[PDB]
Amino acid sequence: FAATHNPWASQAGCLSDVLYNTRHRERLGYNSKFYSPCAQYFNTEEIIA
């Protein structure tokens, strides 16, 4: 019942959201073959659907 226990890694437009949400990773260019294990935790345009 706090707000967020990691405010560098939760906001829309933080460091971790621009590093691991797959939309901005496509906007930076990345190997799709590399499995990143945090991609399942920041794919917020897929869990929103």
């Binding site: 939309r23 496509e26 906007r27 930076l28 260019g29």
Partner: protein
């Protein structure tokens, strides 16, 4: 009758803040046509003092100096001065009776009691009723005060009539339920008054039961105040013509700068065996004829009118920001959204030396044609107007920006700019700033949709 009494009581209501005394007016077919009177949306009017600035802006000075700055991003001063110029005018009451009538007969059909010095049979083709309040700053009043009128049709057009208050209060101050007493007292005299340019006259009424008659103002008309009020009106008129002066000295500068070997920037087939000494001589004879026929209704004034709008300055900044960017990266094109100047509306001055008939305002849609296409100038209907084939014409082209082309027949052109830095800013707005649409009857609430038919309070039908 309908607006005169109401706005009289309304100026009695609002007299405390701005001491505006009513001027009850009627117009006729000399002011405007019947079609223009049937669809007149609303009227704007402006009080401007003997010093000649405004009644809306600041008393001493303004942020409207620093003459033009010749910019595209601000391009006048930004939109704060546009907000100022919107705050200058006021929206006065308004009523149209589009049916032929005799005025004293019509006030006899109403409850008003008419008595003039001598019977003047006035007969006009329709009637539009308008009241104006000129603002005396103190209780006293200056004779060299001047007014402005604006008549707005729903297309966005405007007509400006301007005149001094000296001719409005010349004879009047020298001789000098409430709705039931107002009809019983009624009018004292009827007076026609021309404007400052003698292009249109209009009639004013004078009621004895108005609250103007008991205010006891003082009236003085000093000649040095009249001398400066025409000087302020001089610069107001001169904003249109010294801009045309600024176009002509630009041509003479760049031609001396180039040296007489001007290039081609327009697509025309040519013929080498045709003489060109005859073509150069018809450049000089026709260029002065354009200055002989200069007018506010011209292409270079229509080039400025979209730039002095509300959302013009921010969109102009958005234009260069879209250009001045990096090339799309390889990561961008595969996953970014799809990224967006085909043809532009140019305005044209067509002069013709064979018959001395010069056309001032012309819509031209021009675009780059393929295979190193310089420029080609089509009409609104793809007509490809083909005046610049003929030897008898010369044509001037302007852009929505301040870019400028003077084109000889055969499509040979002179590419230069438009300099307005000699022009100040506050006279640049009030002549031709693009005013915004204000919502009225039959208007959609949201900004722009399929608009319905016009109101058209006309005389062909019944009112209903």
């Amino acid at each position: 009758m309908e607006t005169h009494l109401y706005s009289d009581l309304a100026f009695e209501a609002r007299f405390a803040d701005d001491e505006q005394l009513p001027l009850h007016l009627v117009l006729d077919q000399e002011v405007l046509s019947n079609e223009e009177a049937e669809t007149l949306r609303y009227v704007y009017y402006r009080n401007v003092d003997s010093a000649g600035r405004s009644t809306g802006r600041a008393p001493g000075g303004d942020e409207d100096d620093a003459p033009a700055s010749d910019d595209a991003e601000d391009a006048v001063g930004g939109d704060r001065a546009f907000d100022r110029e919107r705050r200058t005018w006021q929206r006065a009451c308004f009523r149209v009776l589009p049916r032929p009538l005799e005025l004293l007969d019509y006030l006899r059909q109403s409850g008003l009691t008419v008595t003039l010095e001598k019977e003047q049979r006035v007969r006009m083709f329709y009637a539009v009723f308008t009241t104006l309040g000129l603002r005396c700053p103190d209780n006293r009043l200056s004779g060299a005060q001047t007014l402005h009128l604006r008549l707005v049709w729903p297309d966005g057009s405007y007509r400006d009539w301007e005149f001094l208050a000296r001719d409005l209060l010349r004879e009047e101050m020298e001789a000098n339920a409430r709705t039931d007493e107002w009809k019983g007292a009624g009018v004292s005299r009827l007076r026609e008054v021309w404007d400052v340019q003698h292009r249109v006259r209009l009639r004013v009424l004078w009621y004895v039961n108005s609250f103007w008659r008991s205010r006891e103002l003082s009236y003085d008309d000093h000649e040095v105040e009249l001398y400066r009020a025409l000087d302020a009106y001089r610069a107001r008129i001169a904003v249109e013509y010294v801009l045309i002066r600024a176009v002509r000295d630009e041509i003479y500068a760049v031609l001396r700068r180039d040296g007489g070997a001007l290039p081609q920037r327009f697509a025309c087939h040519v013929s080498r065996n045709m003489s060109w000494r005859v073509v150069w001589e018809l450049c000089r004879h026709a260029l002065a004829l354009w200055m002989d026929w200069a007018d506010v209704r011209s292409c270079i004034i229509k080039a400025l009118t979209p730039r002095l709008s509300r959302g013009a300055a921010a969109a102009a900044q958005r234009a260069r920001r879209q250009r001045e960017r990096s090339a799309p990266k390889p990561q961008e094109l595969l996953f970014g959204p799809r990224n967006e100047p085909a043809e532009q509306t140019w305005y044209a001055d067509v002069v013709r030396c064979v018959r001395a008939q010069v056309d001032l305002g012309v819509e031209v849609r021009a675009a780059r044609c393929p295979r190193t296409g310089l420029w080609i100038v089509r009409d609104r209907r793809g007509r490809l107007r083909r005046w610049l084939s003929q030897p008898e014409v010369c044509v001037l082209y302007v852009t929505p920006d301040l870019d400028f082309y003077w084109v000889l027949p055969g499509g040979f052109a002179v590419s230069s700019r438009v300099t307005l830095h000699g022009l100040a800013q506050r006279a640049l707005r009030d002549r031709f700033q693009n005013f915004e649409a204000v919502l009225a009857r039959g208007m959609h609430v949201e900004a722009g949709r399929q608009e319905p038919e016009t109101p058209r309070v006309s005389g062909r039908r019944l009112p209903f």
